[PDB]
């Protein structure tokens, strides 16, 4: 009974996340077809994505619960189509800000994809199904990245046709979305945990690490363009992004497989991984070699996945399936608030308006500071 909804949802997720154009956005936005500057991209366009995502998170969380998840998934597909149509045929900074708003809407509506399974699949099949819905999606992204590189290097395709392929993929995903079964019920509408100190502590670290990770991901490509201009040197953004995603997945799988007492070693290992993330970011900032910056990105992604897997495991050790949704919603909202504060202060034109050449110094300092503060409280 679960096979049909599971298969349709996994097909939708795979085709929605298969986007060969994603790895090559900055070379595309700054290329001769859009002619946008790196300052405009980093300090005027990209920040909007956070703002909308913060604004649309809670409403969409409640809409998704009230109007059941299928409508929200269809809305996400429509948003994908509109976003990629505007990316393909949009021109100027204002159109790009609208594109960022719609992509933030897509990110906010992504919650329905992972909450849909609960209302259709029996509790018995939750775990495995979730795993599938996760595995598939990750593979899709990796596949797209690899394909992009294989098309950029061997097929000598243009960034425009990568966006065309992404548009076709999202259109197919939306068509698949139109065939998901209607959920009959919902967790909250159609049916105090933070008191525990451990839950609060682990959620705080999860939120801060997630904010840092998402801030670094939004501008890693701009940093790469700064170090290795795409208009004069060969770039390997697809291969690097595929390898980094694979390393992160392997790190998460290793965390899952190995059994160790995280109640005691968790703080030590998490501090060590935060220090490694800070060191990798410092290497990306200081190093003038592009290969060193790729290696730093790989290390940062793998270590952050090592971190977040343990954090999520510790948060979710005693939480129920129903409470997962609200706890993780609150944690992602707080992470978005932190990321929005950081963007307003640092990246936004109304703050320091720092270029990408100084932003990663701030990000490395941010991770080092998280590690330093959390190391405290040992004595006294």
């Amino acid at each position, epitope marked *: 009974s679960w096979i049909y909804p599971t298969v349709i949802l996994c097909l939708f997720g795979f085709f929605s996340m298969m986007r060969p154009s994603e790895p090559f956005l900055i070379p595309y936005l700054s290329g001769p077809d859009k002619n946008l500057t790196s300052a405009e991209i980093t*300090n*005027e366009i990209f920040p909007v994505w956070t703002y909308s995502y913060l604004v649309l998170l809670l409403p969409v969380f409640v809409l998704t619960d009230y109007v059941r998840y299928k409508p929200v998934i269809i809305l996400q597909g429509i948003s994908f189509i509109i976003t990629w149509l505007l990316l393909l045929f949009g*021109q100027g900074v204002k159109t790009m800000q609208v594109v960022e708003f719609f992509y933030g809407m897509v990110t906010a509506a992504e919650v329905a994809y992972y909450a849909y399974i609960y209302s259709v699949v029996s509790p018995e099949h939750y775990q495995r199904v979730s795993g599938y819905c996760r595995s598939v999606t990750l593979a899709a992204y990796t596949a797209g990245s690899v394909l992009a590189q294989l098309l950029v290097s061997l097929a000598n395709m243009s960034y425009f046709y990568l966006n065309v392929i992404s548009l076709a993929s999202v259109s197919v995903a939306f068509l698949f979305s139109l065939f998901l079964p209607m959920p009959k019920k919902s967790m909250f509408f159609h049916a105090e945990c933070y008191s525990s100190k451990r839950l609060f502590y682990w959620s705080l670290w999860w939120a801060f690490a997630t904010a840092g990770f998402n801030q670094v991901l939004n501008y890693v490509q701009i940093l790469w363009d700064y170090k290795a201009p795409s208009q004069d040197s060969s770039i390997y953004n697809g291969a690097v992004e595929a390898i980094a995603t694979f390393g992160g997945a392997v790190a998460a799988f290793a965390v899952g497989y190995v059994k160790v007492n995280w109640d005691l070693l968790g703080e030590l290992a998490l501090v060590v991984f935060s220090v490694v993330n800070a060191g990798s970011l410092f290497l990306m900032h200081y190093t003038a070699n592009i290969w060193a910056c790729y290696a730093g990105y790989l290390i940062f992604k793998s270590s952050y996945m090592l971190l977040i897997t343990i954090a999520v495991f510790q948060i979710a050790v005693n939480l129920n399936v129903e409470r997962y949704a609200l706890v993780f919603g609150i944690n992602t909202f707080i992470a978005l608030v932190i990321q929005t504060i950081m963007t307003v202060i640092v990246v936004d*034109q109304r*703050g320091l308006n720092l*270029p990408v050449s100084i932003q990663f110094l701030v990000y490395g300092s941010y991770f080092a500071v998280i590690a330093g503060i959390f190391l405290m409280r040992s004595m006294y």
Partner: nanobody
Amino acid sequence: QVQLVESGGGLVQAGDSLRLSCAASGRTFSNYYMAWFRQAPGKEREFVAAIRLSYGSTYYADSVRGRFTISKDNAKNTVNLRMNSLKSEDTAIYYCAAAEDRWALAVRTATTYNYWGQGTQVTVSS
């Protein structure tokens, strides 16, 4: 006191190119935003393109994006603006303005800049 002086503007047949230069004097200019605005009769002052001297960051308006390029020639404390494929819609008076770099600086807002040139007129004839 800062003094911005513009040169280069003139009568150019539509479709050609033209280079405008704004030289700033009276101070050491290393931490200023240098921007170009334009104003046409019966219209308001419009942002054209800005450059961050310290970092070299550049911003353009969508109307002139892809055609106008703003650079800096520090050897003479000048900021240049090269305009290619000029159209009749580019006829205006161009003012170069200088703003002090600082927290929360709105690059595209004319009120942000406290130093303005006398303006050089660029007329495009079809």
